[PDB]
Amino acid sequence: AKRWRLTDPYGKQYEFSNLHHFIRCNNNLFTRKDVVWKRTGEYCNASAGLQNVVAGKSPAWKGWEIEEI
């Protein structure tokens, strides 16, 4: 039962339990190319970047921040 807070490059915040599902339901928040899903399960530029942010490798992906609640 995980919870995540995602902050857009301007401070707007969203809360959800699954990042992939949120991305799939909110394509309009990102550029098109960043939510094209590719195989290597599946990934998109947004999911991979935000997951690297979650791992602590980078504080943000294209201004997007994400943290575990």
Where is 46: in which H helix or E strand?
helix 45-54
Rounded Cα–Cα distance for residues 50 and 44 (Å): 10
- With a CB cutoff of 8 Å and minimum separation 6, the contacts of 17 are 1, 2, 3, 4
Tell me which residue has tokens 């401070």. 11
Are the C-beta atoms of residues 13 and 68 closer than 8 Å to each other? no
Single out the residue of 21, 4, 11 nearest to residue 68, CA to CA: 4
Count the Cβ atoms, other than its own, within 10 Å of residue 46: 26
Single out the residue of 11, 62, 8, 53 nearest to residue 34, CA to CA: 62
CA angle 49, 51, 53 (to 5 degrees): 75
